[PDB]
Amino acid sequence: NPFPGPQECMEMMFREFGTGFEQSNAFIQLLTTLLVPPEGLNDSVPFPEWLGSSIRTLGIEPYVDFVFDVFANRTKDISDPSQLRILRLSCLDFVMVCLVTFNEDLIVLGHES
Amino acid sequence: FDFINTDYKWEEIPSPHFTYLKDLDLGPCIGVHYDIRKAQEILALKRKEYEHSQLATPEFLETVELEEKVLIEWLTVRNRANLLLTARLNLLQAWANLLLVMIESNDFKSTPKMAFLLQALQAILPTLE
Amino acid sequence: IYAKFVSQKISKTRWRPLPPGSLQTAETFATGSWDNEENYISLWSIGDEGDHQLLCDIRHHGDVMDLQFFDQERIVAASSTGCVTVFLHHPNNQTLSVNQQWTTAHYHSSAPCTGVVCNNPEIVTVGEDGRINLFRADHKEAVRTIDNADSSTLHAVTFLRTPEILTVNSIGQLKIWDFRQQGNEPSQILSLTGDRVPLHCVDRHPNQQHVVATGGQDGMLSIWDVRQGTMPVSLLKAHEAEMWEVHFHPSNPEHLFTCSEDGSLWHWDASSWLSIEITSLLPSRSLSVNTLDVLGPCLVCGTDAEAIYVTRHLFS
């Protein structure tokens, strides 16, 4: 409720924070840092399980969805090659921080026994 | 040798928008001589057809009138440009023939005429470029 | 048909109208873009894969939400910012300028202008604020604003016979208004009962002022006759996602065209809608087709693949 339904206000704010490169990279870095657990880089996924339970939202998915949509579509409005490279590096770091925080052997042993 | 000048741009011509009558070509008009009556009759027939169509005939009449008044001057300018181009071509051919006859039939020494040779080279350099 | 890639997602495509009594077919079109830091309004000509020439462009602040030609040289755009702008094309030096604008056409803070239609000298707009404006060229303020006309989001508008209009909204209602009316309620509401499916686009039949087509969230095509009660005359299954635009062919309205979020553009051929063969014109790999325009044998459309598709030979 940034002062209009929430599903619309959230996407409006995301699109507003998508214009340009500085704010986009800063938001990507902030999200990447927030996705890090407090114990440092296995259980207790680094986010509250009740994140977005009040409103009809899928949790933390909207964030990754918007990040991927940006990285896939709005990479042509960056003229400065350095800014584009920095944005791509930030997106790759975000993807790596999201992937490295997934349990493989745990899920295997779970589905097995 | 001051008649060769491309600054006037006798070849280039500013083409107006011509939102209407654009499809009317100069086929039957054309010795480069574009007759004006061959296009006048065509544009008159087209105006008559448009008037018979009964679709905003009074308002758009001035547009066709001014387009015709521009096309007639366009044709006259094209004819004048063609005439000037052929005249310049004939003059250049005559000058080249004169220069060839002068260079060939010349028993005078060449070291004194080297100055005029270099001057002619300098003058033709931009013409060729 | 062929594609050209233009480096921006194209929200809107419109053909420039032809000069009265022209025997030529459409060759110049305008585009508006969305989802960039810098969006543009652009004019293009097609030469005789095609050869396209960018004539000129101009930065448009906000996403281009809608776009229509007002006359040969004037283009009206609706912004996500709520601004409505008339751009003027100067053919002599191929530039675009701002002719006039209404920066507070829609507002809450900013409220997107979702739809614009033109009937020179009038311009009608709708927006997410549920406001409906009548503007007139060279008048600084709206002729009339119906404040809080709809409590749902207004998605599109069409003229019926001016000053009568019809709007469609996010709960599937067609509402009829007149700018001479008292109050903020419509004269007539039409809707399909059951699911209140959002309607995203509407077009009036060019010859039958009482007939409109709409496109929905569910991809369906509805035909309505405003004299025939409150439900549609026809409801036809179509696309697999939202239908974004629907257009009757201007000179032969037995043909109608629809485009969708699912990446398709359909040519519907009823040769009458009261009260059918369908050809899908774009390839199977298309992203959302946001917009189309048809004039004579010419079709143009714009997609989220940053592509413009054109044919100048729909019927040959």
* Contact criterion met (CB < 8 Å) for B56 and C72: no
Which amino acid does the sequence have at C17? P
> What residues in C contact A18, CB-CB < 8 Å?
37
In this structure, the number of other CB atoms found within 10 A of the CB of residue A70 comes to 20
C94 touches chain B (CB under 8 A): no
Contacts of A19 in chain C (CB under 8 A): 37
Give partners of A (≥3 CB pairs < 8 A).
Answer: C
**Which tokens is C80 given?**
């996500």
Judged by CB atoms closer than 8 Å, whether chains meet at B20 and C91 is answered as no
Rg (CA), chain C: 18
Residues 6+ apart with CB under 8 A from C8: A76, C33, C36, C39, C40, C306
Please tell me which residue of chain A has the smallest CA distance to C111: A4
**Looking at this protein, which amino acid is placed at residue C154?**
L
The resolution, in angstroms to one decimal, equals 23.0
User: Do the chains contact at A74 and C35, CB–CB below 8 Å?
Assistant: yes
Go through chain C and tell me how many residues it has: 316
Q: In B1-129, where do the E strands start and end?
A: none
Phi then psi for C309, rounded to 5 degrees? -110, 140
Chain C residue with CA closest to B14: the answer is: C92
**CB atoms near residue C193 (< 10 Å):** 8
Query: Chain A residues with CB inside 8 Å of C8's CB?
Result: 76
| Candidate from C21, C72, C92 with C-beta closest to B50 | C21
**Strands, E, within C121-252: which ranges?**
122-127, 132-136, 144-146, 154-159, 164-169, 173-178, 188-191, 199-204, 211-216, 221-225, 234-236, 243-248
Cβ pair C22:B55 closer than 8 A: no
The per-residue DSSP string of B8-23 comes to T-SS-------SSSTT
Of C22, C24, C91, the CB nearest to B17: C91
Which positions 19-58 of B are in contact with C (Cβ < 8 Å)?
19-20, 22-23, 50, 53, 55-56
Is A76 strand, coil or helix?
coil
- What residues of chain A have any CB closer than 8 angstroms to a CB in chain C? 4, 18-20, 73-74, 76-77
* Interchain CB distance below 8 Å, C37 and A74: yes
Burial label for B9, CB within 10 Å (0-12, 13-18, 19+), is: exposed
Burial B111-125, CB ≥16 within 10 A → b, else e: eeeeeeeeeeeeeee
Contacts of C19 in chain B (CB under 8 A): 19-20
The helix (H) or strand (E) run that includes residue A82 is helix A81-99
Please tell me the distance from the alpha carbon of residue A21 to that of residue C167, in angstroms, as a whole number: 38
**What order of strands is seen across the sheet that includes strand C10-15?**
C10-15, C28-33, C39-46, C52-60
Query: Residue A4 is encoded by which pair of tokens?
Result: 């209009």
| Contacting residues of C for A77, CB less than 8 Å apart | 36-38
Tell me whether residues B20 and C19 touch, CB distance under 8 A: yes
Chain pair B-C, CB pairs under 8 angstroms: 18
What's phi and psi for A8, nearest 5 deg? Answer: -85, -40
Token reading at C22: 């022209």
Give the distance from residue C23's alpha carbon to the nearest chain B alpha carbon, in angstroms: 8
Closest CA to C164 of C115, C209, C230: C209
Give the DSSP letter of residue A85. H
Tokens of C78: 């609706």
Q: Do chains C and A touch (3 or more CB pairs under 8 A)?
A: yes
Distance CA C17, CA C29 (A): 9
Q: Which two tokens stand for residue B88?
A: 């310049």
Judged by 3 or more CB pairs under 8 A, whether B touches A is no
Angle at C64 between CA A87 and CA A31, to 5 degrees: 25
Task: Name the nearest CA neighbour of C161 among C141, C139, C180, C143.
Answer: C180
> To the nearest whole angstrom, how far is the Cα of A13 from the nearest Cα of chain C?
12
Q: Do chains B and C touch (3 or more CB pairs under 8 A)?
A: yes
CA atoms within 13 A on the CB side of C295: 18
Kindly write down the DSSP assignment for every residue of A19-40, as one continuous string.
SSSHHHHHHHHHHHHHTS-TT-
Phi and psi of A71, rounded to 5°?
-55, -25
With beta carbons less than 8 A apart as the criterion, state whether C86 and C99 touch: yes
Residues of B within 8 A of C251 (CB-CB) are none
From CA C162, how far away is CA C117, in angstroms rounded? Answer: 11
Experimental method: cryo-EM
**What DSSP letter does each residue of C79-120 carry, written as one string?**
ETTS-EEEEEEETTTTEEEEEEEETTSSB--B--EEEEEEET
What's at C228, amino acid-wise?
Answer: Q
Sign (positive/negative) of CA torsion C184, C190, C192, C198? negative
**15-54 in chain C: CB under 8 A from chain A:** 35-38
Q: Closest Cα of chain A to C295: distance in Å?
A: 31
Cβ of A77 and C108 within 8 Å?
no
Q: What are the backbone angles phi and psi of residue C6, rounded to the nearest 5°?
A: -125, 10
Distance between CA atoms of residues B21 and B93, nearest Å: 39
Query: Rg of chain A's alpha carbons, rounded to an integer?
Result: 16
